[PDB]
């Protein structure tokens, strides 16, 4: 986007001042749409000395004479050329600027336009800038941020000491990663993406994206009328143990509910019986184990079951011990089918195995599992999209790193999912998603496409829950999947 | 507005290119608001070589990549600097321009954006420009005109040989006289006035205006609760004759229906009886005349009746003969009250009398009466706002020149009324307006204010008629006046 601006100015020939005018008027129109008629309100515009403040001067100038009151507090020590030109127009148009901020100033205004820092923020905010941002955050006024709430790092979504909490953020051309990852996503409030005149070709060239309704609609597999269960593929789910007898059921129904033709589970006896007592449409094959866990003695039987399926999901509820580790790694080394690898299969995984595999794989860790897998702290991997890109690329896989914003990447293309709510922050919700993914692969979507569609729908199903989100359980999520599909078309 | 642009660029410092960008994007937003989502449509943008075409190139560039198709036909022989810059951006952005127009071209587009000529039109359109405008007018496509439909003279509203008929016109800063007077008003279609960044102080300095709802709302006189009929003034209407016994009734009820306290008519006996047989709330004084018309023998009685009133209306239905002429001119010369002069009092008026009068006057001619009064043709006076300004100024009066757009001026301030429909094109409707004006003067509005409020309300009452407008009669108009008042607040 730095790149996009520069090319639009220097190669396409659009005056920087035209882009700036277009930015500012977008903010005015975005505010009107959100607040209704503006003429009743008093506006306090806070401008830094870079181009973010320049956009703010455009805003302020365009409100002169049309609203109850405008005042600009200019907080910078010097001005970029466009900021200066715009500051000049604001004053020629009769605008009032002050350079000193007093805490009672907020008392006489209804809306704060935050044009202090955008993408040019570097390092922590301290000193007056910070005292001002804290005052705004305590004031309870309506806050509108230009481009990015000041203090959010636009490439990571991290808070650089302190940051503005906005009701509305107006961003230019494309969402920034910092609007999509948390905490930034939270401080952004309602986000509007304004077209300010960049050539559409450049806007489209952007290689990291938000998964949208339209993109999911066009990836959903076709349901031709003349079809049968084989049309829609076969999944095998290798899951469960004497400790975790429910996980397999959640994964199997996840596959069935997204439209898979036939789902079989391989679960240790007698735990396999639990699945068909709840959902008799599932096939649940009993595996004779020694101690209640899968081990090498089960390798041959599971490779046999694998011949008649299109995809195998493995890991939910397996347990994390030596015999499971030996089994999971020998199985995956020999399986010549697409594999969806979750949960305890990730906790015991030898990543050398992924490299030597010809068939594709999707891994679906949460950050605690990802942390253990690559030997880093949870805080080093969380929202770390470059680490995820590098891991996918090195291991030839699709990585689905689950969190409130989920990252889906194969190393070349990275997508961000923002559907969902905290009802998914509960055990079982991941086991459902694993089956969804396996299911869409069985129906013929690629591993990356299956993952894209599944995280969206899984999040959207949670949002359709009728009661308070915290009471949402995995079983109820399963029941909402087909409504999410219907609403998606 | 020529002046407004120049000052905004040269004194306020706004780059001409910024104003042009703002103009173009206004047109895109105006189209979206009218057509809904634009992405389905194909656009043919017709650009001349002046700044009107420059706005058109902005439009076209902003549709690239977002709509089904855009093509520009450039019809000029050379380009102004801003037009050239914009043409340059359109092409750098991947836009297609052709310079030759083929009649089948229209076949493959849904919307024509007309950016051929705006305010720079000079003289008649001929040659290709004309053939193109005729083709567009025959095509039945959706037509959107930039600033002014091409071929309308923006200062007069006249058609310069031929003109585009627009569904939508987007004008910048202020309506132009050519959108307000006919035929231009008709070719404009739906008019949107876009704010493109001019300082509000300059927009406001514009000395000729459209009478709006808000301006009429704030001129409406107050109705304090502790009041009585004397609070709301007294009108005398001197009207009628043996040939025209109904006109007085229409004028008197016009005064009563806008809230006047007491209305008296002075009408020749027995014609005066007609008024109270229809409306017994009217006072209708019998005037003993010799032959059925007012004359000098009635001068003294009418000056007596005049002492006890606040305003006198004169002329409706008087007749146009020598005795009426003598009476009207001696009366007005001696009357030291505000006078509303209509109809046959205008047809016999000696304009020297207006000059020598200390008290104010409003004249309400239609163009046939105005023509006779100043000794010109109907076609020379119709919509001739400068002639009206000069006549008002020279004769120290308010002139209300009635037509589909009515002009109200005292020589300094000129207002245009656009409420109404063809139901008012019927005898009697003027006689009502005369009483309305007299009535608002009696209530304390100035002659110019009374006239402003009356033409608006009189036109708005006609629009509230429930059935087809052509069946509207003066009596029904009277009944709608109080609904128009209510709806105005």
């Amino acid at each position: 986007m730095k790149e996009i601006d520069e090319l639009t100015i220097k190669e396409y020939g659009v005056d920087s001042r035209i882009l700036m005018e277009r930015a500012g008027i977008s903010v005015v129109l975005a505010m009107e749409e959100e607040l209704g008629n503006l003429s009743d309100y008093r506006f306090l515009v806070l401008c830094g000395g870079g181009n973010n403040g320049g956009d703010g001067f455009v805003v302020a100038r365009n409100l002169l004479g049309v609203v109850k009151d405008v005042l600009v507090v200019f907080l910078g020590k010097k001005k970029t050329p466009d900021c200066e030109y715009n500051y000049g127009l604001y004053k020629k148009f009769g605008g009032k600027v002050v350079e000193q901020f007093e805490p009672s100033i907020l008392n006489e205004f209804d809306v704060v336009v935050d044009a202090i820092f955008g993408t040019g923020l570097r390092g922590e905010i301290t000193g007056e800038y910070a005292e001002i941002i804290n005052l705004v955050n305590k004031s309870g006024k309506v806050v509108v941020s230009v481009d990015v709430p000041s203090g959010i790092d636009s490439n990571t979504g991290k808070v650089l000491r302190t940051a503005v909490k906005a009701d509305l953020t107006v961003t230019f051309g494309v969402p920034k990663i910092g609007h999509i990852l948390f905490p930034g996503r939270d401080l952004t409030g309602k986000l509007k993406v304004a077209n300010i005149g960049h050539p559409v070709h450049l806007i489209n060239s952007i290689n990291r994206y938000v998964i949208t309704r339209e993109m999911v609609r066009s990836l959903l597999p076709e349901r031709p009328r003349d079809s049968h269960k084989g049309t829609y593929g076969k999944v095998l789910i290798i899951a469960g143990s004497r400790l975790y007898s429910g996980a397999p059921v959640l994964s199997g129904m996840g596959s069935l509910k997204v439209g898979t033709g036939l789902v079989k589970l391989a679960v240790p006896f007698p735990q396999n019986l639990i699945a068909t007592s709840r959902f008799p449409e599932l096939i649940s094959v009993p595996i004779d184990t020694e101690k209640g866990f899968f081990s090498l003695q089960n390798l041959q039987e599971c490779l046999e079951l694998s011949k008649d399926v299109d995809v195998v999901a493995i890991g939910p509820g397996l347990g994390n011990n030596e015999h499971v580790r030996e089994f999971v790694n020998e199985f995956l080394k020999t399986l010549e089918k697409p594999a969806v690898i979750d949960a305890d299969a990730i906790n015991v995984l030898d990543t050398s195995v992924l490299k030597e595999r010809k068939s594709p794989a999707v891994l679906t860790p949460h950050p605690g599992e990802m942390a253990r897998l690559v030997k880093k702290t949870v805080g080093d991997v969380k929202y770390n999209y470059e680490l995820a890109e590098e891991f996918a690329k090195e291991n030839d896989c699709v990585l689905v790193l689950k969190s409130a914003t989920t990252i889906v990447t194969d190393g070349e293309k990275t997508l961000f999912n923002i559907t969902g709510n905290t009802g998914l922050s509960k055990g079982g919700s991941g086991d459902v998603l694993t089956g969804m993914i396996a299911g869409f692969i069985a129906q013929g979507l690629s591993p990356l496409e299956a993952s894209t569609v599944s995280v969206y729908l899984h999040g959207f199903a949670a949002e359709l829950f009728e009661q308070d989100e915290r009471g949402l359980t995995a079983s109820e999520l399963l029941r909402l999947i087909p409504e999410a599909i219907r609403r998606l078309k | 507005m020529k002046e407004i642009d120049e000052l905004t660029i040269k004194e306020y410092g706004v780059d001409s290119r910024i104003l042009m960008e703002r103009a173009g994007i206004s047109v895109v937003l105006a189209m979206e608001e009218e057509l809904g989502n634009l992405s389905d449509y194909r656009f043919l943008v017709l650009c001349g070589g002046g700044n009107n075409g420059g706005d058109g190139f902005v439009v076209a560039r902003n549709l690239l990549g977002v709509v089904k198709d855009v093509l520009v036909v450039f019809l000029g022989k050379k380009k102004t600097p801003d037009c050239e810059y914009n043409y340059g951006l359109y092409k750098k952005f991947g836009g297609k321009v052709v310079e030759q127009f083929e009649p089948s071209i229209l076949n493959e587009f849904d919307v024509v954006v007309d950016a051929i000529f705006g305010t720079g039109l000079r003289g008649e359109i001929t040659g290709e420009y004309a053939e193109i405008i005729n083709l567009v007018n025959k095509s039945g496509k959706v037509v959107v005109s930039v600033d002014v439909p091409s071929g309308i003279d923006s200062n007069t509203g006249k058609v310069l040989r031929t003109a585009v008929k627009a569904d939508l016109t987007v004008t910048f800063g202020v309506p132009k006289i050519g959108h307000i007077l006919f035929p231009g008003r008709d070719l404009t279609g739906k008019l949107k006035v876009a704010n493109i960044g001019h300082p509000v102080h300059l927009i406001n300095s514009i000395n000729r205006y459209v009478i709006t709802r808000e301006m009429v709302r704030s001129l409406l006189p107050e109705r304090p609760r502790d009041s009585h009929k004397g609070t709301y003034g007294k009108v005398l209407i001197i009207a009628g004759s043996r040939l025209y016994s109904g006109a007085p009734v229409l004028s008197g009820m016009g005064s009563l229906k806008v809230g006047t306290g007491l209305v008296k008519l002075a009408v020749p006996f027995p014609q005066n009886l007609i008024a109270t047989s229809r409306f017994p709330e009217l006072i209708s004084v019998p005037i003993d005349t010799e032959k059925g018309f007012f004359s000098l023998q009635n001068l003294q009685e009418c000056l007596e009746l005049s002492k006890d009133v606040d305003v006198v209306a004169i002329g409706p239905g008087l007749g146009n003969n020598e005795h009426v002429r003598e009476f009207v001119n001696e009366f007005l010369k001696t009357l030291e009250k505000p006078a509303v002069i209509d109809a046959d009092a205008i047809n016999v008026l000696d304009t020297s009398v207006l000059k020598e009068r200390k008290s104010p006057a409003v004249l309400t001619p239609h163009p046939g009466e105005m023509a006779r009064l100043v000794k010109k043709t109907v076609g020379d006076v119709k919509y001739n706002y400068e002639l009206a300004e000069e006549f008002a100024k020279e004769n120290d009066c308010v002139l209300v020149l009635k037509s589909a757009t009515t002009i109200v001026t005292d020589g300094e301030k000129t207002l245009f009324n656009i409420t109404g429909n063809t139901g008012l094109s019927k005898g009697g409707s003027g006689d009502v307006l005369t009483g309305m004006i007299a009535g608002f003067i009696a209530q304390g509005l100035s002659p110019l204010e009374a006239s402003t409020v009356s033409v608006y309300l009189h036109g708005f009452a006609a629009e509230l008629f429930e059935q087809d407008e052509r069946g509207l009669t003066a009596s029904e108009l009277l009944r709608l006046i109080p609904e128009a008042i209510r709806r105005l607040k």
Partner: peptide, 6 residues
């Protein structure tokens, strides 16, 4: 949708 995506 010409000006804003949400």
């Amino acid at each position: 949708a010409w000006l804003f995506e949400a």
